[PDB]
């Protein structure tokens, strides 16, 4: 399945791509409501103080091992974190209907995998705060909404997933 990688034996650091949203954190930031052709805007600033990394270490790969190996091949998110970056989304509500849009942070999924016989034996995971994503739906006080709109039970990528690796040495 997801553990079958065509790679020589050994440890690797993998960039699973930008655009990952986390489980059930969908509405942690709040939602915005507008109507009748009005324009709604929502944005943020992933200032270090706020948006923080999520680590999922394993016996072979601890927090430090993950960070250093990631910031070595890919973007050093620790240095970047000291420089405020902003992002916004805007959408215009429909003629005579209501609009609802909510925001959630996006991340970059990094993995530290242990390959042994073309199958992942161990897997560490890191989510680096990236930017944000908004979802919108038009509505009225009577409409029923698919709950999938509001809830994401399993981590996923809103963009195409990736698999860019580099064998770890030493």
């Amino acid at each position: 399945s997801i553990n079958n990688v065509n790679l020589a034996d050994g440890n690797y650091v993998v960039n699973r791509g930008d655009g990952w949203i986390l489980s059930r954190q969908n509405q942690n930031l709040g939602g915005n409501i507008s109507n009748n052709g009005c324009t709604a805007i929502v944005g943020d600033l992933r200032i270090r103080e706020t948006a923080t990394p999520y680590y999922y270490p394993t016996a072979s790969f601890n927090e430090e091992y993950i960070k250093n190996n990631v910031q070595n091949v890919f973007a050093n998110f620790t240095e970047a974190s000291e420089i405020p970056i902003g992002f916004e989304f805007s959408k215009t509500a429909p003629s005579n209907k209501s609009l609802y849009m909510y925001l959630q942070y996006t991340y970059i999924r990094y993995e530290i995998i242990k390959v042994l016989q073309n199958t992942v034996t161990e897997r560490a995971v890191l989510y680096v705060p990236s930017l944000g994503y908004v979802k919108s739906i038009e509505f009225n006080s009577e409409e029923q909404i698919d709950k999938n709109f509001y809830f994401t039970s399993q981590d996923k990528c809103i963009l195409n997933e990736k698999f860019i690796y580099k064998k770890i040495d030493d």
């Binding site: 509405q27 942690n28 915005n32 409501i33 609802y100 509505f139 006080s141 909404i145």
Partner: protein, 420 residues
Amino acid sequence: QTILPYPNGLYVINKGDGYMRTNDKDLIGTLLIESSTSGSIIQPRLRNTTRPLFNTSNPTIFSQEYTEARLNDAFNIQLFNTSTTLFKFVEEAPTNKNISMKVYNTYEKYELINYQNGNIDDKAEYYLPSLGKCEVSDAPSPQAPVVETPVDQDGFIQTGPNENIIVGVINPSENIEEISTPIPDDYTYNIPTSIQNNACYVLFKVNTTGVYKITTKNNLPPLIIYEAIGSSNRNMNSNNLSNDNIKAIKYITGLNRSDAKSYLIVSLFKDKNYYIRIPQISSSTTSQLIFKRELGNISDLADSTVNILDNLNTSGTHYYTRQSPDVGNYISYQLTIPGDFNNIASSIFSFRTRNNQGIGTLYRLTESINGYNLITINNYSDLLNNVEPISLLNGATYIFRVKVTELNNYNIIFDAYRNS
């Protein structure tokens, strides 16, 4: 005032966004936007302070700090009274008329409840500060006659889209045991003596995806099982269960009822983590948790509690009250026909239900050296009013699967009527 098909425990319900108080208590302001002009109202977060609203029915246990911890367990909300998220509205007035732009602060309503036996014994409402509401419309006439209007009743109104998402959380007052190694096809867990003082959860993962039969050696007490929401495809080790401290749990199947002699049959995936809640065993003799992979069509029962029926050696009605599954889910009953086995000998039975409606399937349970096997004996499209009798071989065992189609009461009653 509706039925909630869940086991006892704690739940965090997201009841929607767009909530705001009455009498414009959350009104930020109104702009009169003259024709051919643009108006804009902004929440720039020049200050990151927000003001949540809280209400509880039990301040000593369901305190705001406690509720916040639950909300964190359920949705992983980090910040409660601060925000760096900006929101802003912009509207341009047509060339023919003026526009009125009203902006209000809003809240997302999260309800924390202590659910016990189909009843809510405690309740707290937490109003998480949200990203506002903007109402634009034709500007009213400055001459419109002033109408004396009575202030509305103090309270909240819902402005956002309909939403009701139930997320259950590990009861923080019950300990969590862990089965470190991915359980193989067969496994037996010895329930620690702590179980004598309070229920506990057992966290584990199966080494191989498939269907499993889980139970205690006496099919008592009944077991409940959950999935750790979001636990799939994160950190993983083939020889060790990586914990994520995920306290958000999805109810798979199980019951609280004490006498409910039973065992579970559920579908389990290795890339996920699960929790089995063992009730408090007020005994002094060690209990066990037995896991067993099951091959064969026993999977037909997949994700269901199989209740072993007692006292069948009499004639007439044979009722069994149990917590009803939600519409679309199963609840099974196992029947070993009273008497001795010899094909010929049989007894007439009539399967029915009383509170909730459903679809039934009757199976013949057969033993083999390749696991169990089921043989469909018949199907029923109306259990509430079923009168069709059926003759079952004495000494044989049958399983009857009910799929709820109508949830009228918290409990569903199964009646294995014996015609003879």
